[PDB]
Design an enzyme around this catalytic site. Sequence first.
Site, PDB file in Angstrom:
ATOM      1  N   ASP A 139       0.845  -1.184   0.000  1.00 61.65           N
ATOM      2  CA  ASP A 139       0.000   0.000   0.000  1.00 61.65           C
ATOM      3  C   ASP A 139       0.890   1.247   0.000  1.00 61.65           C
ATOM      4  O   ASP A 139       2.095   1.152   0.251  1.00 61.65           O
ATOM      5  CB  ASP A 139      -0.912  -0.042   1.229  1.00 61.65           C
ATOM      6  CG  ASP A 139      -2.234   0.713   1.037  1.00 61.65           C
ATOM      7  OD1 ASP A 139      -2.394   1.480   0.066  1.00 61.65           O
ATOM      8  OD2 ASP A 139      -3.126   0.537   1.887  1.00 61.65           O
ATOM      9  N   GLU A 172       0.255  -0.388  -5.289  1.00 60.87           N
ATOM     10  CA  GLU A 172      -0.757   0.668  -5.401  1.00 60.87           C
ATOM     11  C   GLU A 172      -0.094   1.966  -5.872  1.00 60.87           C
ATOM     12  O   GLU A 172      -0.632   3.062  -5.727  1.00 60.87           O
ATOM     13  CB  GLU A 172      -1.477   0.843  -4.074  1.00 60.87           C
ATOM     14  CG  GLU A 172      -2.117  -0.456  -3.599  1.00 60.87           C
ATOM     15  CD  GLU A 172      -3.236  -0.241  -2.601  1.00 60.87           C
ATOM     16  OE1 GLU A 172      -4.127   0.607  -2.852  1.00 60.87           O
ATOM     17  OE2 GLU A 172      -3.233  -0.940  -1.574  1.00 60.87           O
ATOM     18  N   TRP A 173       1.064   1.794  -6.493  1.00 62.25           N
ATOM     19  CA  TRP A 173       1.935   2.872  -6.938  1.00 62.25           C
ATOM     20  C   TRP A 173       1.231   3.894  -7.858  1.00 62.25           C
ATOM     21  O   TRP A 173       1.215   5.081  -7.544  1.00 62.25           O
ATOM     22  CB  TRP A 173       3.170   2.218  -7.575  1.00 62.25           C
ATOM     23  CG  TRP A 173       4.256   3.091  -8.098  1.00 62.25           C
ATOM     24  CD1 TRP A 173       4.338   4.451  -8.054  1.00 62.25           C
ATOM     25  CD2 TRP A 173       5.460   2.636  -8.725  1.00 62.25           C
ATOM     26  NE1 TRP A 173       5.504   4.871  -8.644  1.00 62.25           N
ATOM     27  CE2 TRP A 173       6.212   3.775  -9.062  1.00 62.25           C
ATOM     28  CE3 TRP A 173       5.965   1.370  -9.051  1.00 62.25           C
ATOM     29  CZ2 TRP A 173       7.446   3.691  -9.704  1.00 62.25           C
ATOM     30  CZ3 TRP A 173       7.184   1.286  -9.681  1.00 62.25           C
ATOM     31  CH2 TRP A 173       7.914   2.441 -10.008  1.00 62.25           C
ATOM     32  N   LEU A 175      -1.965   4.486  -8.270  1.00 63.01           N
ATOM     33  CA  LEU A 175      -3.052   5.102  -7.505  1.00 63.01           C
ATOM     34  C   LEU A 175      -2.583   6.269  -6.632  1.00 63.01           C
ATOM     35  O   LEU A 175      -3.228   7.326  -6.590  1.00 63.01           O
ATOM     36  CB  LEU A 175      -3.766   4.049  -6.642  1.00 63.01           C
ATOM     37  CG  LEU A 175      -4.764   4.561  -5.599  1.00 63.01           C
ATOM     38  CD1 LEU A 175      -5.852   5.398  -6.250  1.00 63.01           C
ATOM     39  CD2 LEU A 175      -5.373   3.390  -4.842  1.00 63.01           C
ATOM     40  N   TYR A 176      -1.476   6.082  -5.921  1.00 64.59           N
ATOM     41  CA  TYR A 176      -0.976   7.137  -5.029  1.00 64.59           C
ATOM     42  C   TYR A 176      -0.195   8.222  -5.786  1.00 64.59           C
ATOM     43  O   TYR A 176       0.042   9.299  -5.247  1.00 64.59           O
ATOM     44  CB  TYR A 176      -0.154   6.539  -3.887  1.00 64.59           C
ATOM     45  CG  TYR A 176      -1.023   5.845  -2.857  1.00 64.59           C
ATOM     46  CD1 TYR A 176      -1.495   6.524  -1.748  1.00 64.59           C
ATOM     47  CD2 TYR A 176      -1.387   4.515  -3.011  1.00 64.59           C
ATOM     48  CE1 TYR A 176      -2.307   5.894  -0.810  1.00 64.59           C
ATOM     49  CE2 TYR A 176      -2.185   3.877  -2.087  1.00 64.59           C
ATOM     50  CZ  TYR A 176      -2.644   4.572  -0.988  1.00 64.59           C
ATOM     51  OH  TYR A 176      -3.440   3.931  -0.075  1.00 64.59           O
ATOM     52  N   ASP A 200     -10.532   2.955  -3.931  1.00 63.61           N
ATOM     53  CA  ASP A 200     -11.035   1.704  -3.348  1.00 63.61           C
ATOM     54  C   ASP A 200     -12.455   1.396  -3.792  1.00 63.61           C
ATOM     55  O   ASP A 200     -13.332   2.257  -3.741  1.00 63.61           O
ATOM     56  CB  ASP A 200     -11.031   1.766  -1.820  1.00 63.61           C
ATOM     57  CG  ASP A 200      -9.630   1.816  -1.233  1.00 63.61           C
ATOM     58  OD1 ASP A 200      -8.642   1.696  -1.996  1.00 63.61           O
ATOM     59  OD2 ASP A 200      -9.524   1.996  -0.001  1.00 63.61           O
TER      60      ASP A 200
HETATM   61  O1  DGJ Z   1      -6.145   0.088   4.924  1.00 59.42           O
HETATM   62  C1  DGJ Z   1      -6.066  -0.878   3.872  1.00 59.42           C
HETATM   63  C2  DGJ Z   1      -6.661  -0.274   2.618  1.00 59.42           C
HETATM   64  N1  DGJ Z   1      -5.839   0.855   2.195  1.00 59.42           N
HETATM   65  C3  DGJ Z   1      -6.055   1.481   0.908  1.00 59.42           C
HETATM   66  C4  DGJ Z   1      -6.057   0.373  -0.143  1.00 59.42           C
HETATM   67  O2  DGJ Z   1      -6.255   0.918  -1.449  1.00 59.42           O
HETATM   68  C5  DGJ Z   1      -7.134  -0.661   0.189  1.00 59.42           C
HETATM   69  O3  DGJ Z   1      -7.224  -1.638  -0.868  1.00 59.42           O
HETATM   70  C6  DGJ Z   1      -6.802  -1.330   1.523  1.00 59.42           C
HETATM   71  O4  DGJ Z   1      -5.603  -2.128   1.399  1.00 59.42           O
END
Ligand code: DGJ
Lengths: 391, 390
Positions: A139, A172-173, A175-176, A200
């Site tokens: 994450d 999740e690179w 996305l952030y 999410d």
């Molecule tokens: O807190 C966990 C949560 N964080 C943000 C992520 O995008 C979600 O899929 C999940 O892993």
Amino acid sequence: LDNGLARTPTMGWLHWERFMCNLDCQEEPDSCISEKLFMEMAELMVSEGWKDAGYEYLCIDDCWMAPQRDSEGRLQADPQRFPHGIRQLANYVHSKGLKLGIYADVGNKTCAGFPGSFGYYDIDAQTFADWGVDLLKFDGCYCDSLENLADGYKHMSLALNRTGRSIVYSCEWPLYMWPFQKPNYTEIRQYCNHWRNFADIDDSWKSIKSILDWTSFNQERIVDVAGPGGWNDPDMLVIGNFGLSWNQQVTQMALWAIMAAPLFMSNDLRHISPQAKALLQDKDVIAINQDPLGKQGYQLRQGDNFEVWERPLSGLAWAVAMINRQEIGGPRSYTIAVASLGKGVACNPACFITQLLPVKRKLGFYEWTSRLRSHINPTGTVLLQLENTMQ
Amino acid sequence: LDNGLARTPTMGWLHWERFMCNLDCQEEPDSCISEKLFMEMAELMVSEGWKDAGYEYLCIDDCWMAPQRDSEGRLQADPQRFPHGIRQLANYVHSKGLKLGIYADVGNKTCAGFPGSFGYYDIDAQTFADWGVDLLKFDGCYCDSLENLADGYKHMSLALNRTGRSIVYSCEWPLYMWPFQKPNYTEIRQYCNHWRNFADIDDSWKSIKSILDWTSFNQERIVDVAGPGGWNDPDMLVIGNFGLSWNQQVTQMALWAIMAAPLFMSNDLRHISPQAKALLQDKDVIAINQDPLGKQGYQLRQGDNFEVWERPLSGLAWAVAMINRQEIGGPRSYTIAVASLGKGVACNPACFITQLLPVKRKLGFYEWTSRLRSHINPTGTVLLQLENTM
Ligand SMILES: OC[C@H]1NC[C@H](O)[C@@H](O)[C@H]1O
Ligand SMILES: *[C@@H]1O[C@H](CO)[C@@H](O[C@@H]2O[C@H](CO)[C@@H](O[C@@H]3O[C@H](CO[C@H]4O[C@H](CO)[C@@H](O)[C@H](O)[C@@H]4O)[C@@H](O)[C@H](O[C@H]4O[C@H](CO)[C@@H](O)[C@H](O)[C@@H]4O)[C@@H]3O[C@@H]3OC[C@@H](O)[C@H](O)[C@H]3O)[C@H](O)[C@H]2NC(C)=O)[C@H](O[C@@H]2O[C@@H](C)[C@@H](O)[C@@H](O)[C@@H]2O)[C@H]1NC(C)=O
Ligand SMILES: *[C@@H]1O[C@H](CO)[C@@H](O[C@@H]2O[C@H](CO)[C@@H](O[C@@H]3O[C@H](CO)[C@@H](O)[C@H](O[C@H]4O[C@H](CO)[C@@H](O)[C@H](O)[C@@H]4O)[C@@H]3O[C@@H]3OC[C@@H](O)[C@H](O)[C@H]3O)[C@H](O)[C@H]2NC(C)=O)[C@H](O)[C@H]1NC(C)=O
Ligand SMILES: *[C@@H]1O[C@H](CO)[C@@H](O[C@@H]2O[C@H](CO)[C@@H](O[C@@H]3O[C@H](CO)[C@@H](O)[C@H](O)[C@@H]3O[C@@H]3OC[C@@H](O)[C@H](O)[C@H]3O)[C@H](O)[C@H]2NC(C)=O)[C@H](O[C@@H]2O[C@@H](C)[C@@H](O)[C@@H](O)[C@@H]2O)[C@H]1NC(C)=O
Ligand SMILES: *[C@@H]1O[C@H](CO)[C@@H](O[C@@H]2O[C@H](CO)[C@@H](O[C@@H]3O[C@H](CO)[C@@H](O)[C@H](O)[C@@H]3O)[C@H](O)[C@H]2NC(C)=O)[C@H](O[C@@H]2O[C@@H](C)[C@@H](O)[C@@H](O)[C@@H]2O)[C@H]1NC(C)=O
Ligand SMILES: *[C@@H]1O[C@H](CO)[C@@H](O[C@@H]2O[C@H](CO)[C@@H](O)[C@H](O)[C@H]2NC(C)=O)[C@H](O[C@@H]2O[C@@H](C)[C@@H](O)[C@@H](O)[C@@H]2O)[C@H]1NC(C)=O
Ligand SMILES: *[C@@H]1O[C@H](CO)[C@@H](O)[C@H](O)[C@H]1NC(C)=O
Ligand SMILES: OC[C@H]1NC[C@H](O)[C@@H](O)[C@H]1O
């Protein structure tokens, strides 16, 4: 990522959407994040047919950790909720023929506020490999810098590689990154097996729609980078939960197959309807998602509250998905020329069309000049397979 | 409206949401707006238990009319889609022990573009009475001014009365004047049996939510004006269609009962699931909706993505609905002090509590100081009935 893993999209189960960060084991022992939950899901994953359908990875998300690292600087499983430790859980999961997935965060803390891996990438990689972990979801929370974010994701990828253990790396690179700068998917693909692009998912049709709309809006950027070893991740399947009508559930299954998405169920396998189960275990729809060619599908046409998506498959076949986005009234007919499908080669000179959702039905042979007509429920989808033939 | 009708909220079926303005009888003969469709629904209303559950009014919405009035200035049923005419349909419906509802518009055209009743209120009122119409839904499109709108709705109410036939009068007066001026519900109540306040419902959870949120936001204005003979109309029940999960369907049924809503199904009675049928025919929930005291319910409490609504019933009983508005996760534990319920008198000194939705289950006797713990599915509702006991 060229680690020989995820040659087809990864399939499994992930606790987050359905179970979240429930730490209340006193009042809610069967739903709290604990070793018992994962032991039970592992059992059901085998006995209820999920493993046989291809769902292989039992994955732990956030909130598995103790509040602090141990004296050697390791992550610890929470001692009350995971008293037997992750190593024993991994062994349990492997004895069922399954794989174990786990969660960590690139920054200082996890999103739920537990210990983050910044400054500990090698220690954490080696801890997970020692335990027998088979997949890491990484994450992006609590990272102050886009440089540190990118560097952390790259460092962990290398750190996992150095362990010598084969570990699927889920990132999740992008996305952030997306809010601040355009992700470089050529770079991301070299380092990750799959990657989250968008916000999410939750248990809502609104959420499914926005993911499809953001995927189609950005499809020029993301469709062509996907392939064996590296997939776009539109987040968990929420089929079997509470917020989706039957038609909306068919839509998610169909489009996640078109998109060559990892298929991570987040539901309660102890309490799932026969219908949702049959949809999620649908051998024909899963075969599309798992097609060895690994070319991600795309939105072809949009108009009149209808969407047409298509995906190229191996053996000269194609999957076509037609969504009815009008949320009022009844079934609406959609008619399309088969010559507009599959870049003009799907049914040239002919093709056999088989409908797969919402029911399986052979539709017969269609010439290059033929028109295809289907009725589609509001918020529902018709998924077809076009099998090219020279007859 | 003091015509002796709608002493409890009106129940029936209305074609609009599910069938809309489908005129394509060539390619879609079973789904187009025709006498066949309404005859089939009538048959099923009797045979499949709908009439016995209380669903009495079979209502035609927009798009039943011919493009033009006849030479005598009367509305006509479309000659190709209703070749036997409305009078024969009304007779057929009345032979099944049901009642017939029809649609017109206060302005120059109906919302779909057919003939409106402006300048013809007495003609149309009398035409409907002559045909044996039992309910009129009167829409608000293509009306130039607020003066015309108000005057139109009042004129038609009086015109219906003068025919001498008992006709339920269903208005959209507040909906169509809200944007420009605050409605006078005291006036509206005098002229109408029920009134649409908010935008058209559709087959979505988003739209159910919006209706409840707009109702609760405006509940100080509208709750107390409801009562026998005049109800707030939050629009059709869309249970049995395509866009609502099972929990979302239960929520609509529960909250429409709490709100003393008219219960106008808009679905395909030829193709409805057993679950949706059992829910729509749920005798205990319908009894709440039809409670003779006729006091509309209201939102009591909001917080932690939960909402509590309650409705006072006859015989010192209460109905309580607790909604889970969190659209992520699993069933969520909600605890409520029963002393918060029914203004503190519901369980003084005690009450017997029975859960009705999503399953029926006696929960037992609760004292004034007790706490009720429920588990509520995301977007779902738990509906309880409290019986006060000494
Ligand atoms: O807190 C966990 C949560 N964080 C943000 C992520 O995008 C979600 O899929 C999940 O892993
Ligand atoms: C349903 O639709 C009906 C048909 O459209 C509506 O009836 C119309 O209502 C109009 C007002 O809303 C009304 O307009 C007036 O027309 C007068 C004479 O007609 C002129 O125009 C003809 C062609 O358009 C032309 O052939 C003639 O030669 C005429 O010139 C006209 O005198 C009026 O003007 C008045 O106001 C101006 C401005 O203040 C003054 O300067 C002027 O001295 C006069 O007092 C008016 O015309 C214009 O209205 C719009 C405004 O912006 C302009 O400035 C003004 O000039 C029209 O007569 C009818 N149409 C027909 C075909 O009958 C009906 O409206 C309702 O019912 C009518 C009878 C009336 O009571 C209205 O107030 C109502 O709203 C619609 N009903 C509903 C419920 O929606
Ligand atoms: C840490 O990183 C290193 C690389 O930095 C990893 O080593 C790489 O491991 C993969 C394992 O598959 C290996 O790829 C194969 O290479 C051999 C030739 O040496 C080919 O025969 C393979 O092709 C066959 O199998 C693949 C399935 O992976 C299939 O797609 C083919 O059709 C064929 O049957 C395969 O070559 C790959 O083929 C797919 C294509 O997309 C790739 O470009 C191509 O590499 C790499 O050779 C190997 N890299 C190096 C530099 O040695 C190591 O596994 C990893 N360790 C851990 C613990 O994660
Ligand atoms: C056209 O409009 C008039 C009013 O403008 C309607 O007349 C009213 O009809 C009401 C219902 O039938 C009458 O109220 C009832 O009165 C009797 C005797 O007291 C009682 O048994 C009922 O419970 C009811 O009593 C109350 O009425 C007042 C309300 O505040 C209260 O909620 C009720 O409980 C009412 O007296 C009467 N008003 C006037 C001014 O005459 C008329 O309704 C028609 O006439 C009545 C007498 C009856 O024949 C009905 O079947 C019939 O609908 C209405 N006409 C039409 C065709 O709609
Ligand atoms: C997105 O990320 C990819 C992969 O990192 C970038 O492509 C890579 O760029 C590297 C550095 O610019 C290249 O390294 C070179 O290696 C050769 C060896 O023959 C050296 O001679 C040379 O000095 C460099 O060190 C690398 O070749 C390249 N990798 C791949 C797989 O293409 C990409 O960079 C963009 O494209 C490359 C081809 C160049 O045109 C760059 O100028 C350009 O930035 C990244 N794209 C973006 C938009 O950032
Ligand atoms: C909204 O409509 C109500 C019903 O027409 C109005 O009350 C009525 O007002 C008449 C005088 O305009 C009066 O003869 C009636 O007795 C009375 N009806 C009832 C049932 O009370 C109401 O008018 C307001 O309230 C009345 C009592 C007076 O104070 C008026 O001056 C007020 O305007 C209407 N309310 C509004 C805000 O327009
Ligand atoms: C984490 O926070 C510490 C201070 O607590 C700071 O020194 C460090 O730079 C931060 N690192 C990241 C990656 O956010
Ligand atoms: O066109 C008819 C349509 N008009 C708008 C109304 O509010 C709807 O209920 C429906 O009657």
